[PDB]
DNA sequence: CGACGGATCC
DNA sequence: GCTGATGCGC
DNA sequence: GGATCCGTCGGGCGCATCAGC
C-alpha cells in the first residue's frame, strides 16, 4: 500500500538534457478541477503540453482561467456531439502544432470527444479517454471494436512519424496496477478482453509502457482511486493512465511520473520528460 | 468497485 | 427564470 | 476456524435534467 514515486530524472541515458514536459490528467469536470486549484498545481508543473481528459464542459461553458495559462495558450477541445457532462478531452500547448486532427477516422468512434491528435516535427502526440465496458459489461462489445480501431489508427501514425498516446486508456494491462486484482477479474478495468486489447497494442504498432520500462517490477503505483469509501488513503487504485511510447523514443524517455499527492479529481496527474 | 459475506476446500 | 430533487454514467 | 474464491450490493463524485415553484 506505500507509493512515494521516484525523483524526477530530467536526463537520457545518453547524457541528453530532458526538453519536453508533458503532463495528462483526467480532472473529473474541468469546472469542478479548475475550483479545487488544478490549475496552480499545472502552474507548478510548467508543462510544455498538458492533455485533459473528461473535462465534461463545452468550448461556450469553457472557464475563463484556461485563458490565464500563459505557457499554454495554444488551446483544442474536444466534446461529444450529443451528450452534455460527458467525456470530453483537451490539449493545451507551448508551441502551436503542425496539424490538430479530432478522432480516430472510424465515425462510429468520433462522436463522444474522445481524442486529439496533435502533429510536431519530431513525433505526433494522441491524448485520449478510452470508453469503459459498463456495469455489467454493457459497452464491453463497443470497447473491442474500439480498440481495433484504436490500434489501427495510430499504427498508420506511428508509419510516419514517431508516437506517444497518454490518457485514460480505461485498462490496468496486469496485476500490478491494481491493488485488488482477483475481486475485479470480470469488473470493468481488469477484464480479459481488455487486457488481451492493451497488449495488441503494444504490439500492433508498436507501443512501449513509458512507467513499466523504467520501473518493470514496481508495485503500488496507481492513477485511478475511487471516490467510493477512502481508497486514495488505504492505496487502493487503479493504473489506467498512461504514456505509451513509439520504440524509437526510449532512447529519448528520461521519466515517467505519478503525481500521487496533485488531488481535484478521482485520477492524479501523470508526468513525462524527454530529450527530443 | 471495495466492502462483505457465503460457500466451499483443507 | 430560478432552484432543489433525481437520473446517469461511473 | 480459517484460507480462499467468487458473487452481490449500494453509494462518493460532477453535471445537468427538469419538478415545482
Ligand atoms: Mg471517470
Redesign the pocket.
Known sequence: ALYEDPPDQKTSPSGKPATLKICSWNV?????WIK?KGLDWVKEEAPDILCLQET???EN?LPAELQELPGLSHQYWSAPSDK????GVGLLSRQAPLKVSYGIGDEEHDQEGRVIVAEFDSFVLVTAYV??A??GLV?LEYRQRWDEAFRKFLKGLASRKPLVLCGDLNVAHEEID???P???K????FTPQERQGFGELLQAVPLADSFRHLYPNTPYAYTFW????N?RS?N???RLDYFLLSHSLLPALCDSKIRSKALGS?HCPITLYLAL
Open positions: 473529473d469536470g474541468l469546472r469542478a479545487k465534461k464542459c463545452s461553458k452534455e457532462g460527458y467525456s470508453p469503459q459498463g456495469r459497452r491494481l491493488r485488488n482477483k475481486g475485479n470480470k469488473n470493468a478495468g475511487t471516490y467510493m469509501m481508497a488505504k487502493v487504485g487503479w478521482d
